[PDB]
Design a binder for this molecule. Structure first.
Ligand SMILES: [Cl-]
Ligand code: NA
Ligand code: NA
Lengths: 101, 103
């Protein structure tokens, strides 16, 4: 439900540099946090947002907005994702929204 | 008259100057340490009343960090410290951030 309700679109295998980077980044962070690979999705929003859940209720998931991928550098986005993966590992849902100054 | 000098409940929406209770002291100390480590000035810190678990911050100008009572009720010190450290990193970049948890 966490994905469907936002119209999130799952990346099943990487087909461009952005998908490759997102999967490898989340994969490395999940590995380091001692958890299974989450489903990874992109959804449409102008906001710079990522949300993630490792709650019992949900399939494990990391979803990033198109606005995040458009506006964040890889280094910036990797920091946000690493923090959200820490919440998944805690069995929580997290959403974070940023605005650049 | 009985309550004068005792630890008091945080006032939602009030900027924290002199801690009213031990959580306020911990919050100033934690944010102060993170700010020092990130190389920025001490943010203004406030607690606001909400059942939602949220902290937000802005470093666009100096900065402010605002934490919900829901967050303080629901997160351990280590968990809250990690959220605050992450938000301080955004302030240090001159950015603004808001983060909400559903536990
Ligand atoms: Cl409290
Ligand atoms: Na879009
Ligand atoms: Na609320």
């Amino acid at each position: 439900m966490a994905l469907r309700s936002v119209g999130g679109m799952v990346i099943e295998s990487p087909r461009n540099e952005t998908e490759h980077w997102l999967l490898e980044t989340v994969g490395r962070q999940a590995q380091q946090a001692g958890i299974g690979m989450p489903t990874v999705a992109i959804y449409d929003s102008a906001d710079i947002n990522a949300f993630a859940t490792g709650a019992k209720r949900d399939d494990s998931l990391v979803a990033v907005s198109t606005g995040l991928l458009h506006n964040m550098t890889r280094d910036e986005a990797e920091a946000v994702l690493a923090h959200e993966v820490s919440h998944i590992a805690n069995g929580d849902m997290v959403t974070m929204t940023l605005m650049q100054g």
